[PDB]
């Protein structure tokens, strides 16, 4: 009943899509043909530390500390030390996942100069993590989703460091292309500056009539006495919305972490000769009847088509006021292409000369091992171990958050569209079936995106393995290139702060295990603590 | 010293031709409604250089935007066509209220435009029949003292008859 009621709306908006997508590709292409990748330093930081624009990672000089800094370094490199160090802490009911999440990030921020080693430890931590969970008769499918322990949090990092190169020679494009497909399609219509809702909203939640299309001729601020720069816009955009439009059109090349913020800039309508007024988003000339503020717009200030404008150094409700599905298909159809492109190059073994990153294959070989190690013949099981490792952890993370990869500024509405795609992305990875708005739109696409994630896993399994020799070579490469990319002192000193908290249990276990005791590791530990 | 000035008045009364037939000493021709512009002219009055900056404004669709020209004004020049009694009445009702609202305590130099339409015979044809007569000096001069205008000055943007007299007083009143 509901399936025969949608294919009729898709057929009517079918033709509209072909002319909608086309007008975007031609516009977006030229807007980038003739990429702001966050450098490894920036990219990796925004992933290992959520919302941490602060230090200490890239940064102090201490005398009585550096002498003990080398101790904690060479001692942490000891395979067993780093294992007992984790097993003892995790065993305590002191710190929660929140702490298990930073420690996993600190260590990766320390052993980056020896990724060939930290990969050995990670495999050992992921081994036990699987053993403990299968020794307790836990349902296999429900293992890596979600306990988010210590090992898993390191694995999330492991992929971050290695899949950077892949976000360059391949994946980088369809993502930025998808982001610029949204950012440019929402602005196609009105965007309530107050509610965040938009005209062509992809999410049936942030979905918002009569509006016109004007086209201004801004005067490129970075230059002077040369050709102007036109910018297509609406007569409803806030003065703040437009200052964003112009800043995006004027600074097409230049990244965002360099553009003059929209707040530090004032819009000036250039008319006549030397006559120009500073139109503020909310000044003395503002409309309103009752106790309420009315955001100043174009029609409110009466803006004319082709008007000349310039950005100068700066010195409530908007629109809506509380078969409507036909519009949703318009957006779902127009962007239908941009997505299949990304979901294809995510589930692609060989793409544009670039093969599959060793990180993935090597890790998928690993899970197949542990799986064959426990006679787990159920394909559904190891299918869900893989999903809960790569796709649903690292990929879904940058689809919902593409500002971690790029030097961009995700606005309100754009985030409400990446979520709807990110949701469909998860569902396509899940082996389980399903029977509202989201599941209905891509109801006839989820089956297909699944077949891809299967073929994708199968192909990696058919491939020839990677020798423990070649992997140690590839890891050593990715370990030297970004060796001292981050102040290791800050990360190593931070870890030491924790070994002081539960120093008791730590020393008892470093003296319990015949391993850490045979190589008199407990002694090197005592020397490291006192000295510091 | 710079002296900011604004020229508010009804549509098609000769505010643009007034500010053009002065800054360029030439009178244009065809009429194109103004949205908002700005002119410049530096002259010496009684021995003192001034940076006069005339601010041509519109005249009812641009009422919700006009007020962006009043900020920091040192003198206003309310305008009305000497042959448009309709505009002469809007001096007390439309403009004087609005002007003194944003920039009160600032001088105001009322001005009667199209002085050349006074001593005309052809215009009278379309006036006598319309039962309306041109604005006389008295009727206007009283309107000036009524609205608290520092001075009443009539000129012709076309013939430049006493056109320079107007701006001379607008600076003398500041
Ligand atoms: N003969 C004559 N015509 C005049 C004089 N002043 C203005 N006009 C006429 O008045 C018409 C409108 O002039 P204009 O200055 O543009 O009026 P305005 O006050 O600018 N109108 P707006 O405010 O709507 O732009 C023109 O066609 C012009 O010929 C004047 O002193 N003499
Ligand atoms: Mg005018």
CA B123, B129, B131, B132: dihedral to nearest 10 degrees?
-10
Question: What domains does chain A contain, in order, with CATH numbers?
Answer: 1-210+323-532 (1.10.506.10), 211-322 (3.10.20.90)
Residue A56 preceded by cis peptide, ω within 30: yes
Using CB atoms within 10 Å of the CB of residue A359, give its burial: 0 to 12 exposed, 13 to 18 middle, 19+ buried: buried
CA A383 to chain centre: 23
Of the candidates A21, A65, A58, which has an alpha carbon nearest to the alpha carbon of residue A42?
Answer: A58
Using CA atoms, how far apart are residues B162 and B82, in angstroms rounded to an integer? Answer: 14
Using CB atoms within 10 Å of the CB of residue A426, give its burial: 0 to 12 exposed, 13 to 18 middle, 19+ buried: middle
Q: Are the C-beta atoms of A118 and A111 separated by less than 8 Å? A: yes
Q: Spell out the residues 6+ positions from residue A135 whose beta carbon is closer than 8 angstroms to its own.
A: none
Q: Which protein residue's CA is at the shortest distance from atom 26 of ligand 1? A: B31
Q: Are the C-beta atoms of A238 and A297 separated by less than 8 Å? A: yes
- Which single residue is written with the structure tokens 């440019």? A184
CA of B39 to the centre of ligand 2 (A): 12
Q: Which residues pair with B76 in a beta bridge?
A: B6, B108
Give the ligand whose atoms come closest to the C-alpha of residue B27: 1
Q: Spell out the residues 6+ positions from residue A190 whose beta carbon is closer than 8 angstroms to its own.
A: A198, A199, A208, A209, A211, A234, A236, A237, A319
Neighbours of B59 (CB within 10 A): 24
Using CA atoms, how far apart are residues B172 and B167, in angstroms rounded to an integer? Answer: 9
Ligand 1, pocket-test mutation among B6, B16, B90, most atoms within 8 A of CB: B16
Neighbours of B158 (CB within 10 A): 18
Judge if the beta carbon of residue B37 lies within 6 A of ligand 1.
Answer: no
Residue A294 structure tokens:
């009315």
Q: Are the C-beta atoms of A396 and A422 separated by less than 8 Å? A: yes
Using CA atoms, how far apart are residues B164 and B158, in angstroms rounded to an integer? Answer: 12
Method: X-ray
Secondary structure of residue B112 in the 3-state scheme: strand
| B33 in a known ligand binding site | yes
Using CA atoms, how far apart are residues A422 and A404, in angstroms rounded to an integer? Answer: 15
Of the candidates A35, A54, A37, A36, which has an alpha carbon nearest to the alpha carbon of residue A45?
Answer: A54
Neighbours of A220 (CB within 10 A): 16
> Measured between alpha carbons, how far apart are the two ends of chain A, in Å?
72
- Residues of A with CB below 8 A from B67's CB? 284-285
Using CA atoms, how far apart are residues A150 and A469, in angstroms rounded to an integer? Answer: 27
Using CA atoms, how far apart are residues A110 and A118, in angstroms rounded to an integer? Answer: 10
Q: Which residues pair with B75 in a beta bridge?
A: B5
User: How far apart, in Å, are the Cα atoms of A124 and each of A108, A117, A130?
Assistant: 15, 11, 10
Using CA atoms, how far apart are residues A16 and B75, in angstroms rounded to an integer? Answer: 57
| B163 in a known ligand binding site | no
Residue A383 structure tokens:
């299918």
Judge if the beta carbon of residue B28 lies within 6 A of ligand 1.
Answer: no
Using CA atoms, how far apart are residues B36 and B19, in angstroms rounded to an integer? Answer: 12
Phi, psi angles (nearest 5°) of residue B50: -135, 145
Q: Are the C-beta atoms of B5 and B73 separated by less than 8 Å? A: yes
Domain B1-174 - what CATH class? alpha beta
Using CA atoms, how far apart are residues B50 and A294, in angstroms rounded to an integer? Answer: 40
- Residues of A with CB below 8 A from B69's CB? 277
Q: Which protein residue's CA is at the shortest distance from atom 18 of ligand 1? A: B12
Q: Which protein residue's CA is at the shortest distance from atom 6 of ligand 1? A: B14
Length of chain A in terms of residues written? 532
Q: Does A317 touch chain B (CB under 8 A)?
A: no
Using CA atoms, how far apart are residues B120 and B115, in angstroms rounded to an integer? Answer: 9
HSE value, Cβ hemisphere, 13 Å, CA-based, for B58? 14
Q: Are the C-beta atoms of B73 and B103 separated by less than 8 Å? A: yes
Return the biggest CA–CA distance within chain B: 49
Beta strand ranges found along A187-264 (DSSP E): 213-218, 229-234
Residue A336 structure tokens:
């239908």
Return the biggest CA–CA distance within chain A: 87
Q: Are the C-beta atoms of A333 and A10 separated by less than 8 Å? A: yes
B72 conformational bin, left if phi > 0, alpha if psi -120 to 50, beta if neither? left
Using CA atoms, how far apart are residues A532 and A157, in angstroms rounded to an integer? Answer: 29
């Amino acid at each position: 009943r509901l399936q025969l009621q949608m294919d009729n709306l898709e057929s009517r908006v079918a033709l509209e899509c072909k002319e909608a997508f086309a007008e975007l590709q031609t516009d977006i292409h030229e807007l980038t043909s003739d990429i702001p990748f966050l450098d490894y330093r920036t990219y990796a930081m925004r992933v290992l530390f959520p919302g941490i624009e602060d230090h200490p990672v890239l940064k102090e000089v201490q005398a009585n500390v550096e002498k003990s800094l080398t101790l904690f370094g060479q001692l942490l490199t000891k395979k067993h030390f780093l294992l007992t160090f984790i097993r003892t802490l995790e065993a305590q009911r002191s710190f929660s996942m929140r702490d298990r999440g930073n420690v996993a990030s600190l260590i990766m921020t320390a052993l980056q100069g020896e990724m060939e080693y930290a990969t050995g430890v990670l495999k050992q931590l992921l081994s036990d993590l699987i053993e403990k969970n299968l020794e307790s008769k836990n349902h296999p499918k429900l293992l890596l989703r979600r306990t988010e322990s210590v090992a898993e949090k390191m694995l999330t990092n492991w992929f971050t460091f290695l899949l950077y190169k892949f976000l360059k020679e391949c994946a980088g494009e369809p993502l930025f292309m998808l982001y610029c497909a949204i950012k440019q399609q929402m602005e196609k219509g009105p965007i309530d500056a107050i509610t965040g809702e938009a005209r062509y909203s992809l999410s049936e939640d942030k979905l918002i009539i009569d509006y016109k299309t004007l086209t201004l001729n801004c005067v490129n601020p970075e230059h002077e006495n040369a050709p102007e720069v036109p910018v297509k816009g609406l007569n409803c955009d806030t003065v703040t919305q437009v200052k964003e439009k112009l800043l995006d059109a004027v600074y097409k090349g230049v990244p965002y972490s360099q553009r003059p913020k929209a707040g530090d800039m004032d819009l000036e309508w250039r008319q006549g000769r030397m006559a120009r007024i500073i139109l503020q988003d909310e000044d003395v000339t503002t409309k309103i009847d009752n106790d309420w503020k009315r955001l100043n717009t174009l029609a409110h200030y009466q803006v004319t088509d082709g008007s000349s404008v310039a950005l100068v150094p700066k010195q409530l409700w908007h629109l809506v006021k509380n078969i409507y599905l036909t519009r949703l298909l318009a957006t779902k159809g127009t962007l239908q292409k941009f997505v299949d492109d990304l979901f294809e190059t995510i589930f692609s073994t060989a793409h544009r000369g670039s093969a599959l990153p060793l990180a993935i294959k090597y890790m998928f070989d690993f899970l197949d091992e542990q799986a064959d190690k426990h006679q787990i013949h159920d394909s559904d099981v190891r299918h869900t171990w893989k999903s809960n490792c790569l796709p649903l952890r690292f990929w879904v993370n940058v689809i919902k958050n593409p500002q971690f990869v790029f030097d961009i500024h995700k606005n309100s509405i754009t985030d409400a569209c990446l979520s709807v795609v990110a949701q469909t992305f998860m569902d396509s990875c899940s082996t389980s079936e399903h029977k509202p708005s989201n599941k209905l739109l891509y109801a006839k696409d989820i089956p297909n995106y699944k077949s891809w994630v299967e073929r994708y896993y199968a192909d990696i399994a058919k491939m020839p393995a990677i020798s423990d020799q070649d992997m140690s070579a590839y890891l050593a490469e990715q370990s030297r290139l970004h060796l001292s990319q981050f102040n290791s002192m800050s990360a190593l000193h931070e870890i030491y702060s924790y070994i002081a908290k539960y120093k008791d249990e730590i020393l008892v276990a470093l003296e319990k295990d015949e391993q850490a005791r045979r190589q008199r590791l407990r002694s090197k530990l005592e020397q490291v603590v006192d000295t510091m | 010293q710079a002296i900011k000035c604004v020229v508010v008045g009804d549509g098609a009364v000769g505010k643009t031709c007034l500010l053009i037939s002065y800054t360029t000493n030439a009178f244009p021709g065809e009429y194109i409604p103004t949205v908002f512009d700005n002119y410049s002219a530096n002259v010496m009055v009684d021995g003192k250089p001034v940076n006069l900056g005339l601010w041509d404004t519109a005249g009812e669709d641009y009422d919700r935007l006009r007020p962006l020209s009043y900020p920091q004004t040192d003198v206003f020049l309310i305008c009305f066509s000497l042959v448009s009694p309709a505009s002469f009445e809007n001096v007390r009702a439309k403009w004087y209220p609005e002007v003194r609202h944003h920039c009160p305590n600032t001088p105001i130099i009322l001005v009667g435009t199209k002085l050349d339409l006074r001593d005309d015979k052809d215009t009278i044809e379309k006036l006598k029949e319309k039962k309306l007569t041109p604005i006389t000096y008295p009727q206007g001069l009283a309107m000036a003292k009524e609205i608290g205008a520092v001075k009443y000055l009539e000129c012709s943007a076309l013939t430049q008859r006493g056109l320079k007299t107007v701006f001379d007083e607008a600076i003398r009143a500041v």
